[PDB]
Amino acid sequence: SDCNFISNFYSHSRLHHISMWKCELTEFVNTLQRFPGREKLKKQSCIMHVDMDCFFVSVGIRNRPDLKGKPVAVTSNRGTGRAPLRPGANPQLEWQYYQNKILKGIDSVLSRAEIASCSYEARQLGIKNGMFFGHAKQLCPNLQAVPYDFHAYKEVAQTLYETLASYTHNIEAVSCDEALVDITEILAETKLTPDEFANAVRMEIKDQTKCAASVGIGSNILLARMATRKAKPDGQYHLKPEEVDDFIRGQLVTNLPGVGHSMESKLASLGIKTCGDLQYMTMAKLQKEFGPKTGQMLYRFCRGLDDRPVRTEKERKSVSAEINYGIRFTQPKEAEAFLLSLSEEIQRRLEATGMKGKRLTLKIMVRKPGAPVETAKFGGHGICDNIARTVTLDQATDNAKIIGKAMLNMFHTMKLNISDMRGVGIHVNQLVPTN
DNA sequence: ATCCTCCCCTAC
DNA sequence: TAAGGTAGGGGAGGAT
Ligand SMILES: Nc1ccn([C@H]2C[C@H](O)[C@@H](COP(=O)(O)OP(=O)(O)OP(=O)(O)O)O2)c(=O)n1
Ligand SMILES: [Mg+2]
Ligand SMILES: [Mg+2]
Ligand SMILES: [Mg+2]
Ligand SMILES: [Mg+2]
């Protein structure tokens, strides 16, 4: 049953989990705006970024001292690095497409399970988060596989924020294992050097989780995030003002928060690889080429300038639910049955968050023409494109029968081969809170 | 100029 | 096998 299929997918999805945890930690921090750790150590803006090292791995091997110091990966694959042969799939074509259009603008039995997190040992060999386990185990035959433990990560994630909250409420939740903290007040009250405090928080986090955090310190958010890169693993790095200009010039532009593979490829065609190359670009040229806001962001960031305060309050703008894995329909009756289920799921989330929406958007992934019907990854969406529809209701609703019905009307206007469908997503906008 | 609407992109 | 989600920023381009 599609009802059990949905529940079962979300049950096993790490990406669904990290998103929920982020949502929860964000709400916890918001709450704090409506300190045992400071007094227990009471015995020019300053920003600290706290980021746990190889978070799933570290938690996974907490109580497994045989795996410390080894190449380890958190993945679904039991450990062989093999999967059943998939004849008619074309891993080569999908990988080329991934390197060409996506990373820019025996193979047949290898595991295509993703590595969620890998140890630093494993990294010293090119294994990175998001690599297929089959391939990783080719780069490093001694890669150790470790199962997910979602309960344990949620517990460490919470312990992490509780700990930071014990020093200050001036926190921004970046993710489940990562927060920004403004420590200007603490340093003034305790009279401690930024480094002394950073060490203290690290010692305490390790004490309470058996997991290591790296800390980056700087006079703004951008600079604190970048210092963390240099701090990892198990360390800290204070990027002082006198070092900013020389540190920044050598950084690959891709390291700037907000520059991914698409922006990188567009900059490389401008002849720009490092932040230093970028500094030579005018504000007017960056805005013309990239738009006003992105243009300005690039100009400022490549200089180490950033004036965003720590955002302690975040308001929810949308609720959604997508599954782009294990979607295979043959009949329009099956697809419409599934749309009505995801509609009950979207009702639960709107309720759980106490919202109703006016604007409803259906997004379908469809197999791309020329792309093989048999996916390289078991259950994968493979190479696809997106069809999207949007409607707007007269009243904000949270009723699945109305949402379901809206999804069926939207789905009918699509020109679609059911057997090419590879993913479905419902997105709710223009929210209003209940009561 | 500001405001819509339909997307692409990015972070984790 | 394997579980490729989720929210928000913002550009293009068009109507107001
Ligand atoms: N491709 C990815 C990236 C991240 N996450 C999960 C696994 C990570 O353990 C956790 C935190 O991600 P980070 O980006 O902080 O990376 P790590 O903590 O694993 O390593 P690092 O030490 O580089 O921060 O989120 C995931 O499921 N899949
Ligand atoms: Mg981390
Ligand atoms: Mg996996
Ligand atoms: Mg992280
Ligand atoms: Mg970047």
Per-domain boundaries in chain A: 35-63+148-249+304-314, 104-147, 250-303, 315-435
The 3-state DSSP class for residue A272 equals coil
Of all residues in chain A, what percent are helix, strand and coil, respectively (each to 5)?
Answer: 45, 20, 35
Residue nearest atom 20 in ligand 1 by C-alpha distance: A54
Is A97 assigned to a binding site?
Answer: no
Cβ pair A286, A299 in contact under 8 A: yes
- Look up tokens 């190359």; give the residue: A277
**CA–CA distance from A88 to each of A276, A371, A375 (Å)?**
47, 11, 8
User: Does A166 count as an annotated binding residue?
Assistant: no
Q: Check if the beta carbon of residue A91 is closer than 8 Å to that of residue A108.
A: yes
**Does residue A146 lie within 7 Å of nucleic acid chain C, judged by its CB?**
no
Name the one residue in this structure whose structure tokens are 């709400």: A27
Residue A100: C-alpha distances to residues A4, A105, A146, A166, A267 (Å): 37, 7, 31, 47, 16
Round and report the angstrom distance from CA (A20) to C1' (C6).
8
CA distance A407 to A340: 8
**How far apart, in Å, are the Cα atoms of A204 and each of A24, A37, A82?**
23, 9, 41
Question: Which residue do the tokens 């079962």 mark?
Answer: A8
C-alpha to C-alpha distances, A217 to A48, A250, A251, A347, nearest whole angstrom: 5, 19, 17, 42
Helices A194-209 and A150-165, axial angle in degrees (round to 10) = 140
Measure the CA–CA gap between A253 and A299, rounded to whole angstroms.
11
- In this complex, which residue's CA is closest to the C1' atom of nucleotide C6? A19
Decide: residue A158, CB within 10 A, 0-12 exposed, 13-18 middle, 19+ buried. Answer: middle
Strand pairing class (A319-323; A421-433):
antiparallel
What are the backbone dihedrals phi and psi of residue A365, each rounded to the nearest 5 degrees, phi first? -85, 130
**What are the φ and ψ backbone dihedral angles of A261, each rounded to 5 degrees?**
-65, -35
Q: Which two tokens stand for residue A379?
A: 């259950």
- The response to whether A52 counts as a known ligand-binding position is yes
Distances (CA, A) of A368 to A3, A94, A96, A130: 28, 11, 15, 23
Domains A104-147 and A250-303 share a fold: no
Q: Is A384 annotated as a binding residue?
A: no
According to the entry, how was the structure determined?
X-ray
What is the Cα–Cα distance from A382 to A422, expressed in whole angstroms? Answer: 8
Q: Given strand A319-323, what is the order of strands in its sheet?
A: A319-323, A421-433, A355-367, A384-397
Distance A275 CA to ligand 4 centre (A): 23
Q: Are A286 and A295 in contact (CB under 8 A)?
A: yes
* Domain A35-63+148-249+304-314 top-level CATH class: alpha beta
Mutate to test the pocket of ligand 1, among A25, A177, A255 (most ligand atoms within 8 A of CB): A177
Among A118, A113, A120, smallest CA distance to A144 is for A118
Distance, CA of A263 to C1' of C1, in Å:
35
- Ligand 1 centroid–CA A272 distance in Å is 28
Q: How far is CA A136 from CA A57, A79, A147, A264, in A?
A: 15, 11, 16, 25
β-pairing, A236-238 with A213-218?
Answer: parallel
Residues 6+ apart with CB under 8 A from A301: A222, A256, A257, A258, A275
Q: What is the CATH superfamily name and number for domain A250-303?
A: 5' to 3' exonuclease, C-terminal subdomain (1.10.150.20)
Amino acid, single-letter form, for residue A106 = I
Atom of ligand 1 nearest to the CA of A120: 22
Spatial CA neighbour of A294 closest among A263, A324, A325, A332: A263
Which CATH superfamily is A315-435 part of? DNA polymerase, Y-family, little finger domain (3.30.1490.100)
Q: Write down the H helix ranges in A302-383.
A: 332-352
Residue partners of A219: CB distance under 8 A and separation at least 6:
A44, A45, A46, A47, A241
Which residues lie near nucleic chain B, judged by CB under 7 A?
Answer: A 15, 18-19, 22, 105, 174-175, 178, 225, 256-264, 385-386, 388-390, 392
* Positions of chain C reached by protein Cβ under 7 A: 1-12
Q: How many whole angstroms separate alpha carbon A94 and alpha carbon A114?
A: 15
Residues at CB less than 6 angstroms from ligand 1: A 14-15, 18, 51-56, 116-117, 129-130, 177-178, 232
Distances in Å between the Cα of A166 and the Cα atoms of A201, A204, A235 are: 10, 11, 21
Cis ω on the peptide bond leading into residue A233 (within 30° of 0)? yes
Tell me, in angstroms, the distance from the centre of ligand 4 to residue A174's CA: 8
By most ligand atoms within 8 Å of CB, the mutation choice from A21, A72, A117, A132 for ligand 1 is: A117
* A73-112: burial string, b at 16+ Cβ within 10 Å, e else: bbbebeeebebeebeebbbeebeebeeeeeeeeeeeebbb
Give domain A104-147's CATH number out of 3.40.1170.60, 3.30.70.260, 3.10.180.10, 3.40.50.620.
Answer: 3.40.1170.60
For residue A397, list its beta bridge partners: A357
d(CA A142, CA A69): 12
Task: Supply A45's token pair.
Answer: 């803006």
DSSP E strands in A298-399: the ranges are 319-323, 355-367, 384-397
Instruction: Count how many Cα atoms sit within 13 Å of the Cα of residue A312 in the half-sphere of its side chain.
Output: 11
- Nearest one of A224, A287, A311 to A215, comparing CA atoms: A224
CA distance A319 to A346: 8
Distance, in Å, from the CA atom of A208 to the CA atom of A192, rounded to the nearest integer, reads 22
Instruction: Give CA–CA dist A299/A416, Å, rounded.
Output: 44
Q: Which nucleotides of B are covered by protein (CB under 7 A)?
A: 5-12
Q: Which of residues 60-99 of A touch strand C (CB under 7 A)?
A: 75-78, 83-84, 98
Angle between the A261-269 and A283-290 helix axes, to the nearest 10 degrees? 120
Give residues preceding each break in chain A, C–N over 2.5 A: 34, 43, 105
Phi-psi region for residue A258, left (φ > 0), alpha (ψ -120 to 50) or beta? left
